[PDB]
Design an enzyme around this catalytic site. Structure first.
Site, PDB file in Angstrom:
ATOM      1  CG  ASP B 276      -2.266   0.748   0.945  1.00  0.00           C
ATOM      2  OD1 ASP B 276      -3.273   0.507   1.648  1.00  0.00           O
ATOM      3  OD2 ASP B 276      -2.251   1.649   0.052  1.00  0.00           O
TER       4      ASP B 276
HETATM    5  O1  LIG Z   1       1.232  16.949   2.389  1.00  0.00           O
HETATM    6  C1  LIG Z   1       0.032  16.997   3.189  1.00  0.00           C
HETATM    7  C2  LIG Z   1      -1.154  17.566   2.400  1.00  0.00           C
HETATM    8  O2  LIG Z   1      -0.800  18.781   1.736  1.00  0.00           O
HETATM    9  C3  LIG Z   1      -1.887  19.536   1.167  1.00  0.00           C
HETATM   10  O3  LIG Z   1      -1.354  20.651   0.443  1.00  0.00           O
HETATM   11  C4  LIG Z   1      -2.700  18.714   0.177  1.00  0.00           C
HETATM   12  O4  LIG Z   1      -4.011  19.261  -0.014  1.00  0.00           O
HETATM   13  C5  LIG Z   1      -2.875  17.267   0.595  1.00  0.00           C
HETATM   14  O5  LIG Z   1      -3.146  16.613  -0.640  1.00  0.00           O
HETATM   15  C6  LIG Z   1      -1.674  16.622   1.326  1.00  0.00           C
HETATM   16  O6  LIG Z   1      -1.769  15.323   1.693  1.00  0.00           O
HETATM   17  C7  LIG Z   1      -1.443  14.163   0.856  1.00  0.00           C
HETATM   18  O7  LIG Z   1      -2.466  14.073  -0.175  1.00  0.00           O
HETATM   19  C8  LIG Z   1      -2.594  12.853  -0.979  1.00  0.00           C
HETATM   20  C9  LIG Z   1      -3.751  12.968  -1.984  1.00  0.00           C
HETATM   21  O8  LIG Z   1      -3.566  14.202  -2.732  1.00  0.00           O
HETATM   22  C10 LIG Z   1      -4.607  14.816  -3.494  1.00  0.00           C
HETATM   23  O9  LIG Z   1      -4.945  16.122  -2.945  1.00  0.00           O
HETATM   24  C11 LIG Z   1      -4.192  17.229  -3.450  1.00  0.00           C
HETATM   25  C12 LIG Z   1      -4.422  17.295  -4.946  1.00  0.00           C
HETATM   26  O10 LIG Z   1      -3.923  18.573  -5.348  1.00  0.00           O
HETATM   27  C13 LIG Z   1      -3.715  16.102  -5.620  1.00  0.00           C
HETATM   28  O11 LIG Z   1      -3.949  16.107  -7.053  1.00  0.00           O
HETATM   29  C14 LIG Z   1      -4.128  14.752  -4.964  1.00  0.00           C
HETATM   30  O12 LIG Z   1      -3.072  13.749  -5.022  1.00  0.00           O
HETATM   31  C15 LIG Z   1      -2.802  11.686  -0.031  1.00  0.00           C
HETATM   32  O13 LIG Z   1      -3.015  10.610  -0.789  1.00  0.00           O
HETATM   33  C16 LIG Z   1      -3.754   9.555  -0.280  1.00  0.00           C
HETATM   34  O14 LIG Z   1      -2.797   8.709   0.409  1.00  0.00           O
HETATM   35  C17 LIG Z   1      -3.500   7.573   0.964  1.00  0.00           C
HETATM   36  C18 LIG Z   1      -2.458   6.948   1.890  1.00  0.00           C
HETATM   37  O15 LIG Z   1      -2.005   8.041   2.665  1.00  0.00           O
HETATM   38  C19 LIG Z   1      -2.816   7.942   3.887  1.00  0.00           C
HETATM   39  O16 LIG Z   1      -3.056   6.641   4.473  1.00  0.00           O
HETATM   40  C20 LIG Z   1      -1.957   6.120   5.243  1.00  0.00           C
HETATM   41  C21 LIG Z   1      -1.279   6.943   6.287  1.00  0.00           C
HETATM   42  O17 LIG Z   1      -0.110   6.202   6.672  1.00  0.00           O
HETATM   43  C22 LIG Z   1      -0.934   8.278   5.631  1.00  0.00           C
HETATM   44  O18 LIG Z   1      -0.346   9.230   6.537  1.00  0.00           O
HETATM   45  C23 LIG Z   1      -2.240   8.834   5.020  1.00  0.00           C
HETATM   46  O19 LIG Z   1      -2.047  10.164   4.533  1.00  0.00           O
HETATM   47  C24 LIG Z   1      -4.062   6.546  -0.022  1.00  0.00           C
HETATM   48  O20 LIG Z   1      -4.292   5.351   0.795  1.00  0.00           O
HETATM   49  C25 LIG Z   1      -3.973   4.113   0.151  1.00  0.00           C
HETATM   50  O21 LIG Z   1      -3.780   4.610  -1.194  1.00  0.00           O
HETATM   51  C26 LIG Z   1      -3.932   3.653  -2.175  1.00  0.00           C
HETATM   52  C27 LIG Z   1      -3.744   4.479  -3.431  1.00  0.00           C
HETATM   53  O22 LIG Z   1      -2.378   4.901  -3.682  1.00  0.00           O
HETATM   54  C28 LIG Z   1      -2.317   5.851  -4.721  1.00  0.00           C
HETATM   55  O23 LIG Z   1      -2.403   7.172  -4.245  1.00  0.00           O
HETATM   56  C29 LIG Z   1      -1.321   7.505  -3.324  1.00  0.00           C
HETATM   57  C30 LIG Z   1       0.028   7.469  -4.007  1.00  0.00           C
HETATM   58  O24 LIG Z   1       1.101   7.820  -3.120  1.00  0.00           O
HETATM   59  C31 LIG Z   1       0.299   6.073  -4.589  1.00  0.00           C
HETATM   60  O25 LIG Z   1       1.470   6.053  -5.401  1.00  0.00           O
HETATM   61  C32 LIG Z   1      -0.934   5.654  -5.415  1.00  0.00           C
HETATM   62  O26 LIG Z   1      -0.831   4.277  -5.876  1.00  0.00           O
HETATM   63  C33 LIG Z   1      -5.268   2.981  -2.095  1.00  0.00           C
HETATM   64  O27 LIG Z   1      -5.533   2.126  -3.256  1.00  0.00           O
HETATM   65  C34 LIG Z   1      -5.291   2.204  -0.844  1.00  0.00           C
HETATM   66  O28 LIG Z   1      -6.593   1.537  -0.729  1.00  0.00           O
HETATM   67  C35 LIG Z   1      -5.143   3.168   0.352  1.00  0.00           C
HETATM   68  O29 LIG Z   1      -5.025   2.455   1.549  1.00  0.00           O
HETATM   69  C36 LIG Z   1      -5.006   7.455  -0.872  1.00  0.00           C
HETATM   70  O30 LIG Z   1      -5.735   6.805  -1.917  1.00  0.00           O
HETATM   71  C37 LIG Z   1      -4.312   8.741  -1.442  1.00  0.00           C
HETATM   72  O31 LIG Z   1      -5.195   9.444  -2.328  1.00  0.00           O
HETATM   73  C38 LIG Z   1      -1.604  11.587   0.928  1.00  0.00           C
HETATM   74  O32 LIG Z   1      -1.793  10.503   1.848  1.00  0.00           O
HETATM   75  C39 LIG Z   1      -1.379  12.886   1.704  1.00  0.00           C
HETATM   76  O33 LIG Z   1      -0.259  12.824   2.564  1.00  0.00           O
END
Ligand SMILES: OC[C@H]1O[C@@H](O)[C@H](O)[C@@H](O)[C@@H]1O[C@@H]1O[C@H](CO[C@H]2OC[C@@H](O)[C@H](O)[C@H]2O)[C@@H](O[C@@H]2O[C@H](CO[C@H]3OC[C@@H](O)[C@H](O)[C@H]3O)[C@@H](O[C@@H]3O[C@H](CO[C@H]4OC[C@@H](O)[C@H](O)[C@H]4O)[C@@H](O)[C@H](O)[C@H]3O)[C@H](O)[C@H]2O)[C@H](O)[C@H]1O
Ligand SMILES: OC[C@H]1O[C@@H](O)[C@H](O)[C@@H](O)[C@@H]1O[C@@H]1O[C@H](CO[C@H]2OC[C@@H](O)[C@H](O)[C@H]2O)[C@@H](O[C@@H]2O[C@H](CO[C@H]3OC[C@@H](O)[C@H](O)[C@H]3O)[C@@H](O[C@@H]3O[C@H](CO[C@H]4OC[C@@H](O)[C@H](O)[C@H]4O)[C@@H](O)[C@H](O)[C@H]3O)[C@H](O)[C@H]2O)[C@H](O)[C@H]1O
Ligand SMILES: *[C@@H]1O[C@H](CO)[C@@H](O[C@@H]2O[C@H](CO)[C@@H](O)[C@H](O)[C@H]2NC(C)=O)[C@H](O)[C@H]1NC(C)=O
Ligand SMILES: *[C@@H]1O[C@H](CO)[C@@H](O[C@@H]2O[C@H](CO)[C@@H](O)[C@H](O)[C@H]2NC(C)=O)[C@H](O)[C@H]1NC(C)=O
Ligand SMILES: O[C@@H]1[C@@H](O)[C@H](O)O[C@H](CO[C@H]2OC[C@@H](O)[C@H](O)[C@H]2O)[C@H]1O
Ligand SMILES: O[C@@H]1[C@@H](O)[C@H](O)O[C@H](CO[C@H]2OC[C@@H](O)[C@H](O)[C@H]2O)[C@H]1O
Ligand SMILES: *[C@@H]1O[C@H](CO)[C@@H](O)[C@H](O)[C@H]1NC(C)=O
Ligand SMILES: *[C@@H]1O[C@H](CO)[C@@H](O)[C@H](O)[C@H]1NC(C)=O
Ligand SMILES: *[C@@H]1O[C@H](CO)[C@@H](O)[C@H](O)[C@H]1NC(C)=O
Ligand SMILES: *[C@@H]1O[C@H](CO)[C@@H](O)[C@H](O)[C@H]1NC(C)=O
Ligand SMILES: *[C@@H]1O[C@H](CO)[C@@H](O)[C@H](O)[C@H]1NC(C)=O
Ligand SMILES: *[C@@H]1O[C@H](CO)[C@@H](O)[C@H](O)[C@H]1NC(C)=O
Ligand SMILES: *[C@@H]1O[C@H](CO)[C@@H](O)[C@H](O)[C@H]1NC(C)=O
Ligand SMILES: *[C@@H]1O[C@H](CO)[C@@H](O)[C@H](O)[C@H]1NC(C)=O
Ligand SMILES: *[C@@H]1O[C@H](CO)[C@@H](O)[C@H](O)[C@H]1NC(C)=O
Ligand SMILES: *[C@@H]1O[C@H](CO)[C@@H](O)[C@H](O)[C@H]1NC(C)=O
Ligand SMILES: *[C@@H]1O[C@H](CO)[C@@H](O)[C@H](O)[C@H]1NC(C)=O
Ligand SMILES: *[C@@H]1O[C@H](CO)[C@@H](O)[C@H](O)[C@H]1NC(C)=O
Ligand SMILES: [Ca+2]
Ligand SMILES: [Ca+2]
Lengths: 755, 755
Positions: B276
């Protein structure tokens, strides 16, 4: 020509072999089944029934229960009749084990009642608990008892479960230290302890009494087994009681892995295991491992006896009466029966029962042994040391003996708020808060009492009287909490919020209690709340909306005197919590020793008292962190810790690391007592481990302005983990040593390295 | 002279061997690390960066993520650039896997949004779910996606956890059937599914996202693994995602027993496992199995890759970049790398990617493939079939299209109440309850709308308007519940009550929602409450104080049309709960499949709405039984079941038992649909087992007055247990077959015997 088993000088194993070879199969069956004194003793009149004693001795004569609320002479006389019958009217004269409860006092009327276990664990004073256990054994042995059904070394890891009060808290180390001391104190009399409830019992699903437990083998070995190993192997307990539950789908009463592979083959335990009461029937009736109706008594016996559960307790269907038929049919190996009997006989020989079958004192000595001033003084001392100061704003406490004091609330007077495992009608004797406060002040202060509310009702008709009491006073003490019942009322079904078979789905104050507090605070009179309870209560608004907040888990018979000692400053409170307090029942579990990756995730939300919502993530509208953590407790004094020093930085598994820290009492005038706590962190591990673990402590009295050097040993062998192959290892690497005043209030740290 | 791996006719294992022998160590590392389209595509402008594509393909080129809220042509164009770069500018031309989310619809703007998983599981219609999954795969493949990150086959066993909505409920059998169908529908396109989150993830401690799970191996095999085995082995999923948690102290990402011994050596799984997102870093940062600061990238790689976690997802520190150094130092066996790469290549060959690397449709065809009327119609049909009728007093429902109807509440209009895993700004498109009710009635009824309250506030300033709307109407529909956020708002931190990383410590309605309902009931206007939510809500006073109560888990884009279909009687509600509803968060867990000895203990207490207390034992003042059990749902019709018949009473492990029951619709006029459920009881077992288990079901449409013979097969091989030696066995003995309308509403039974 005289039997070798009768010779006191012959090695115990030779005595066991000689006696076992003389026994019939029926005599073997009889050693493995628990009888009951009421089989020959009318509980109302004391009248003797020989026919009943003959049958009971024949069929279930190895040991019998005596926990009935009867006069002292009923117990002493009818125990003597049983031991005399065995000597005169059986071939072999195998002395009976004579069993009762001892949890927080010998279970008979007018004996000494100590505070409940969850409370005396807050003393962090295992040596004082050993003195209590020696006095409980003195009282029990006076009447001819030679076995007590304790200690409980279960852990308080499910706060909804009604038996939290019976435990020594949530921590393996503290529970093991207290269980070792309690066991040693009891057995100093040659009375047997009975370590219970083996193993993993007190995390039932949904919090419900006897419900099954989810968990793996690493959790069982890491968290559940250590307190058992300290009480059983290190203190040499002569018996164990298995539990009611299943653990990952194996009933505790039928678990060969725990009862034989761990307990005997790994640990080398020499003695016997009894089932819990009706735990044998449950194999069919609750677990559905056999036909329930009519009960498959053979199947029960074939499940539990070969697993390592030697003795069948009463309260079931006496399934072990099938042993004769099973051995004669070739379904049960006589060697399994012989091993079980050998374990019971080994304990009876080592205890000295064959040389001293009846240990009662004469009637003329009972008042010099039971409910002595030494025991009552110890009850007060240990209760006082167990009280935990949670809050004290702007020196509200201690109170002056002057002016006017309101004493308010359902737990302030009218009944004693004892925990479970007290005899019927105990609640009508003892020192209430009101009694203790009135005694303390004498004619120097006016005491204004009002009940305020009934604990079991939301009726507010008593509030106006309590508000009037508060308004006419300089300070108000409000006493609220939970309640239990005694060994007749609990089983008759009378209302309760804690105790065996009384489980809760909320930890908030019940009924009109919280609204009563709010009514008194609203007078503007400084309000000191005392929680009188058997487990955590969730009322976080009390911390900053009262003048002071005190925890007294269910009291001793001296409870109000111990409470007044603290409230008026004659004793500086020294207790520390044995169990963590959550904000809400929705936040459970809350133990301090969570695995790395738990608890500390994300941001918490909040709901303001005005209804404004502040959204977070863990949780959306709440907080998973403890309200008060394990090991928390304040003082009237303040303590300043120096640098933590280790005597050795580079050690083996074989070594002891001594932790040293200077602690200064910085108060202007008052002596105080600190419990210095040492938490060990295994910084890098091959499997996920508890984030931190208590591994030592020392309770130290420090005069005002004085500095004391506190030294706490850590046996490195005790700091290991259960690795991916389920082997216990102390892995080479760094161990952090965190020293402080609670599991969270860390005042210094040091590191050592295992090679 | 041409490479054998390029020959489509060569057996896949020979293609894998040939390609692997041509690869450099860097090319092997690159197949095991996930890249990201934004490495070459500016998310705001779509502008291409070749230097970024060169680096990403070199270092993390096996697969990449495309889940960004961008126009369709940004995805199609920049996927094409990546596949073209691989073919023209690398030696081997290994096609990329192109990954996005699909949970309840392809994650791109203006694609079809289906109802959330917890809701469509209530359809008990796996064949309709397979049609949904085929349409999701049609939409995804149109833009060049070849891998979707679903299904979730986790179970909803901890109701505080924010991802309940993403699951197919609490039951292994129902989740396995739905996961099999979903996987089959996706992979019918030669797109890869990704079964997640392996294994045991969704019972976190305290309910907190990513917290560790307590449990044993029997629970893991009995309850957690079956849904995985159905989706992975029976449907042939081409990939799996491991989870964030530890299970009894072993991280899921580093568990050799689960990832290798069970998944490969027992089951024979042929393909690859990804971590993940940032799950690799957690080995150090959360679990403390290595140094966190700076991260020990070598230690992470040595823990997870040899365990059987082949691929490192993005969102961490890209620890697998150490593979080159570790192999060159002799710390990592090249055979472990070769096995991991072989698993990824095997899936890519079988999918057909080497013959068809870029599966996108031309731009002129996107509107004929994405958001088609066929897909929108299916969204409405499946949503309608998922709605659960909880109460209907005195024929309140269905409503007539006449008179006046009040439509009240925060979830009735103003935003679409979608679940998580929707794209940014989805909530501004779709049919709200108000939209659907207004469309349904046309000019035949007057609709009186009032918001009533904001979901995120206790402000009651909107109540007077809603009370006025109700008073002027013949009936009131009040729509309340929980809410989540889309894939930008959720991670930006906007307020929510459900979704990934949004966990709760209460299941009661938040804010002014419950007081709003009470205000409307108090008008005396018949009040129909619709719960619009992602998990159970605890408001038991609704059952008998409203006219009707309807559950619609988070809707599709057709949600209000599906809801109006049910409310006005055009469709007779047919949903059954996929998850049990407790009375209170203090009663958890509440799953229907509890082990024998759980749940049914003692007597329950009660708190009356007037504050009178009625004390019990399990619990003192509450009830551990479900408010509504798994499988519950009413109809406008009534169903009468005949005698249960089995085709065979004396069977082997090899046999199938066919259960037959006649079901009559006894309604005077209305056709209805029943979900006939078959629960199996293993009457006597050698270990403690689930009290009952769903093992078959059939959803049947029955005209008014008609009788239908319903037949449900039971494969006897599927009815076994995990014995004390951890072996799967179907033990000889009796199996009870309980047939009925919910897990509690049993209408008939029969018994068969295994020999
Ligand atoms: O840096 C903090 C904060 O800053 C702000 O400026 C911003 O608004 C936030 O986006 C940001 O946080 C990070 O955001 C991303 C999503 O970002 C979107 O929003 C901003 C948009 O502009 C942009 O286009 C978008 O990308 C979060 O992503 C989610 O991550 C989780 C996992 O992270 C969380 O869960 C575990 C815990 O340990 C972490 O601390 C927690 O944050 C995903 O959870 C798993 O994800 C997979 C999917 O993975 C895919 O997306 C993530 C990417 O890294 C990877 O390469 C991809 O394959 C699922 O299939 C699983 O089921 C699931 O368990 C979310 O899906 C994902 O969207 C960041 O977590 C966050 O830090
Ligand atoms: O028949 C129902 C009801 O009838 C009424 O008329 C009556 O008022 C009730 O007493 C009665 O219920 C039964 O009562 C006894 C206690 O009885 C006292 O009250 C009446 C007095 O007149 C009399 O003198 C007293 O004896 C209960 O005893 C308690 O049993 C529990 C175990 O039973 C409970 O827990 C498990 C669950 O499966 C059961 O359904 C539940 O009831 C003990 O729990 C374990 O007990 C051992 C101690 O065992 C000793 O006492 C019991 C006896 O059978 C055995 O031989 C003894 O060794 C502890 O050490 C363990 O720690 C603990 O886990 C209680 O201690 C015991 O007092 C009956 O349960 C109840 O049915
Ligand atoms: C809880 O138990 C107590 C007994 O301990 C009950 O108290 C009796 O209540 C009646 C009327 O309520 C009184 O007339 C008796 O005097 C009470 N006895 C005592 C000792 O106070 C109480 O009613 C029970 N409450 C509930 C809600 O069950
Ligand atoms: C929850 O999030 C919503 C946004 O979805 C917040 O709503 C904004 O609130 C301000 C003042 O409260 C208004 O002026 C905006 O118009 C609101 N936006 C919408 C779309 O309604 C809301 O404030 C948040 N609530 C809490 C308690 O955090
Ligand atoms: O009254 C004593 C003080 O004399 C000592 O100096 O600090 C103690 C601890 O008080 C803190 O903890 C409890 C909170 O309720 C206070 O507001 C803090 O200052 C006091 O008991
Ligand atoms: O309106 C239908 C009836 O026509 C059908 O006959 O019974 C259904 C079930 O109603 C029961 O369950 C729900 C409760 O709320 C009712 O009070 C019961 O009668 C109805 O939907
Ligand atoms: C005990 O004694 C009283 C007679 O005073 C009697 O009522 C009761 O029946 C006796 N109990 C038994 C079991 O004989
Ligand atoms: C005396 O005990 C015998 C044997 O258990 C029993 O049958 C008889 O009923 C008892 N009599 C009394 C008075 O309890
Ligand atoms: C032994 O049994 C006889 C009856 O057979 C009886 O008279 C005698 O009192 C008994 N003695 C003791 C000590 O029980
Ligand atoms: C008490 O127990 C110990 C330990 O078995 C034994 O050595 C000693 O002889 C016993 N004392 C008596 C008086 O029986
Ligand atoms: C009470 O006050 C102090 C503020 O200094 C704070 O540490 C504590 O969190 C507050 N307690 C509660 C329960 O709000
Ligand atoms: C409630 O208290 C909060 C926190 O002090 C404050 O921000 C908010 O304005 C108050 N709300 C109301 C509605 O008074
Ligand atoms: C993407 O494009 C915009 C320029 O229009 C820019 O502001 C942003 O910096 C670019 N992103 C990156 C990472 O270059
Ligand atoms: C293009 O990608 C390269 C390599 O990742 C990166 O260094 C450079 O900063 C990128 N330029 C833009 C405009 O994003
Ligand atoms: C291949 O790389 C060269 C630059 O070295 C570049 O000119 C060309 O456009 C690339 N072709 C593709 C399809 O990426
Ligand atoms: C789709 O996958 C199947 C199963 O591996 C394979 O047999 C078939 O050739 C594939 N079709 C295409 C067009 O690649
Ligand atoms: C609602 O009413 C029926 C009474 O017939 C009952 O079965 C059900 O338990 C009640 N529900 C609640 C939540 O009180
Ligand atoms: C509350 O309701 C209960 C149950 O109907 C009734 O017994 C009790 O008398 C009522 N209590 C009050 C204080 O009105
Ligand atoms: Ca270590
Ligand atoms: Ca069976």
């Amino acid at each position: 020509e005289k039997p070798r088993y009768k010779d006191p000088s012959v090695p115990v194993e030779e005595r066991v072999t000689d006696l076992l070879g003389r026994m019939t199969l029926e005599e073997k069956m009889s050693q493995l089944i628990q009888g009951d004194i009421t089989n020959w003793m009318n509980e109302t009149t004391g009248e003797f029934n020989l026919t009943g004693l003959e049958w009971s001795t024949k069929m279930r004569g190895g040991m019998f229960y005596v926990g009935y609320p009867v006069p002292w002479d009923y117990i002493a006389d009818n125990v003597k009749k049983a031991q005399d019958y065995i000597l005169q009217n059986t071939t072999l004269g195998i002395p009976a084990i004579v069993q009762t409860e001892s949890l927080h006092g010998f279970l008979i009327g007018n004996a000494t009642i100590y505070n409940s276990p969850i409370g005396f664990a807050c003393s962090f004073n295992p040596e004082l608990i050993e003195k209590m256990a020696r006095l409980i054994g003195q009282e029990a042995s006076a009447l001819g008892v030679n076995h007590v059904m304790g200690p409980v070394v279960d852990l308080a890891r499910e706060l909804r479960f009604g038996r939290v009060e019976e435990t020594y808290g949530e921590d393996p180390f503290l529970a093991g230290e207290i269980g070792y001391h309690y066991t040693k104190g009891i057995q100093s009399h040659n009375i047997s302890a009975n370590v219970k409830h083996f193993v993993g019992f007190s995390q039932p699903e949904q919090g419900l009494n006897t419900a099954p437990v989810h968990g793996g083998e690493r959790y069982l070995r890491t968290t559940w087994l250590p307190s058992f190993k300290r009480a059983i192997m290190d203190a040499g307990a002569w018996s164990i009681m298995s539990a009611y539950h299943s653990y990952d789908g194996i009933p505790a009463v039928a678990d060969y892995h725990t009862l034989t592979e761990i307990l005997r083959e790994e640990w080398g335990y020499k003695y016997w295991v009894t089932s819990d009461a009706g735990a044998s029937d449950r194999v069919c009736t609750a677990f559905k491992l056999c036909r329930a109706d009519p009960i498959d008594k053979e199947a029960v016996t074939l499940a539990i006896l070969p697993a390592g559960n030697d003795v069948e307790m009463g309260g079931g269907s006496y399934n072990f009466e099938t042993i004769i038929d099973l051995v004669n049919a070739g379904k049960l190996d006589i060697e399994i029966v012989n091993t079980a009997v050998s374990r019971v006989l080994r304990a009876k020989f080592e205890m000295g029962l064959f040389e001293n079958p009846y240990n009662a004192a004469p009637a003329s000595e009972w008042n010099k042994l039971i409910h002595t001033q030494e025991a009552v003084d110890l009850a007060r001392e240990l209760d006082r040391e167990s009280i935990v100061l949670l809050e004290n704003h702007d020196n509200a406490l201690p109170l002056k003996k002057s002016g006017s004091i309101a004493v308010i609330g359902p737990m302030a007077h009218g009944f004693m708020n004892y925990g479970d495992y007290v005899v019927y009608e105990s609640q009508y004797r003892g020192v209430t808060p009101l009694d203790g406060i009135k005694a303390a002040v004498g004619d120097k202060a006016t005491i204004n009492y009002a009940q305020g509310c009934e604990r079991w009702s939301n009726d507010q008709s008593g509030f106006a009287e309590a508000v009037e009491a508060a308004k006419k006073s300089d300070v108000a003490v409000v006493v609220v909490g939970t309640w239990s019942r005694d060994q007749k009322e609990l089983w008759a079904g009378l209302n309760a919020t804690t105790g065996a078979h009384v489980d809760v789905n909320s930890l908030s104050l019940v009924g009109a209690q919280a609204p009563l507090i709010k009514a008194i605070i609203d007078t503007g009179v400084p309000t000191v709340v005392v929680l009188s309870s058997g487990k955590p209560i969730t009322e976080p608004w009390l911390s900053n909306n009262t003048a002071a907040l005190v925890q007294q888990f269910y009291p001793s018979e001296q409870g109000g005197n111990a409470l007044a000692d603290v409230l008026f400053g004659d004793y500086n409170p020294s207790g520390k919590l044995s169990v963590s307090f959550p904000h809400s029942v929705g936040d459970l579990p809350i133990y301090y020793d969570y695995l790395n990756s738990a608890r500390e995730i994300g941001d918490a939300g909040y709901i303001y008292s005005n209804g404004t919502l502040e959204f977070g993530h863990q949780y959306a509208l709440g907080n998973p962190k403890a309200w008060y953590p394990f090991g928390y407790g304040k003082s009237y004094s303040s303590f300043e810790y120096g640098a933590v020093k280790l005597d050795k930085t580079n050690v083996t598994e074989a070594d002891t690391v001594t932790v040293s820290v200077d602690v200064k009492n910085t108060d202007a005038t008052r002596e105080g007592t600190e419990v210095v706590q040492v938490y060990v962190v295994d910084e890098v591990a091959s499997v996920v481990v508890p984030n931190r673990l208590l591994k030592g402590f020392k309770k130290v009295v420090i005069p005002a302005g004085q500095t004391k050097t506190v030294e706490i040993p850590l046996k490195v062998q005790d700091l290991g983990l259960w690795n991916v192959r389920m082997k216990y290892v102390v892995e080479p690497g760094a161990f952090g040593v965190l020293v402080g005043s609670s599991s969270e209030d860390i005042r210094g740290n040091a590191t050592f390295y295992v090679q």
